[PDB]
Design a protein around this ligand. Structure first.
Ligand SMILES: O=C(Nc1cccc(C(F)(F)F)c1)Nc1ncc(CCNc2ncnc3ccsc23)s1
Length: 262
């Protein structure tokens, strides 16, 4: 492909409409001028990265992504900069974010949910084998390909094991500033499964302090419609003791996953 070749500049691209907004910058549709290749560009600001102390994290993300190749991980082809801005050259996800899909549908059926969980678990299995922990799994970081396949994105917070918004997706060991490993992604997977079926994550609250309290205690309940198989998978992922959480192999072979995934 044309985005694997070169020292990229902004003048190499036609810029299109905004695809999304982020805390650290906007994402735009783009077209590479020579090849006419359609892609996305995320535009970040130097001052903003400097002040937050995250420039090395961005370098690490680009480096991590230079190695990862999986159909359920969104490609990051490389980056360039000008005087004031840094630009990430990204694979375009034509069907948008899972975050937006959930807003539109309110909740997902068991089939769509199990299918997304399967694809996520495959992507994460691959990351963990290449010892990469994602650490930032949530619906805004999950995008959809031409055929509706899930693609994980944003390795800006990723680390090699062991080692911005709400607390909703973070496990007890992370919110308490403790040592943590690959099992953090397993907790976030449980949170996602719940959110997909219910329409909101299990520790959601009006305050950071209440979300913190409920995560620490693993204090949550299921609405009446959540089936016993889904309850089982979620309860075996949302364990305070990280070592007790299901492995990804065990998720992919879970009876509820097997029955409902396409
Ligand atoms: O955002 C990232 N990295 C980061 C972010 C903050 C801070 C840091 C730092 F701390 F500095 F390391 C690093 N990476 C990302 N990688 C992929 C992204 C997805 C961008 N969105 C889209 N992409 C393709 N198609 C569509 C369609 C709709 S939206 C959309 S964001």
């Amino acid at each position: 492909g044309p985005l694997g070749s070169r020292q990229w500049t902004l003048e190499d691209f036609d810029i299109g409409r905004p695809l999304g907004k982020g805390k650290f910058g906007n994402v735009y549709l783009a077209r590479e001028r020579q090849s006419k290749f359609i892609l996305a560009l995320k535009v970040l600001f130097k001052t903003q990265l400097e002040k937050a102390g995250v420039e090395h994290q961005l370098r690490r993300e680009v480096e991590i992504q230079s190695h990862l190749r999986h159909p359920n991980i969104l490609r990051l082809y490389g980056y360039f900069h000008d005087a004031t801005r840094v630009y990430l050259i990204l694979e375009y996800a034509p069907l948008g974010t899972v975050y937006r899909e959930l807003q539109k549908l309110s909740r997902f059926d068991e089939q769509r949910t199990a299918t997304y969980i399967t694809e996520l678990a495959n992507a994460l299995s691959y990351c963990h084998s290449k010892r990469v922990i994602h650490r930032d799994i949530k619906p805004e970081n999950l995008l959809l390909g031409s055929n509706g396949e899930l693609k994980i994105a944003d390795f800006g917070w990723s680390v090699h094991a062991p080692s911005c918004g709400t607390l909703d997706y973070l496990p007890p060991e992370m919110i308490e500033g403790r040592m943590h490993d690959e099992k953090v992604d397993l907790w976030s997977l449980g949170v996602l499964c719940y959110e997909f079926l219910v329409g909101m994550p299990p520790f959601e609250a009006h305050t950071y302090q209440e979300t913190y309290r409920r995560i620490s205690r693993v204090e949550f309940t299921f609405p009446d419609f959540v089936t016993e198989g889904a309850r089982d998978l979620i309860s075996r992922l949302l364990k305070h003791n990280a070592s007790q959480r299901l492995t990804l192999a065990e998720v992919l072979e879970h009876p509820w996953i097997k029955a409902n995934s396409s």
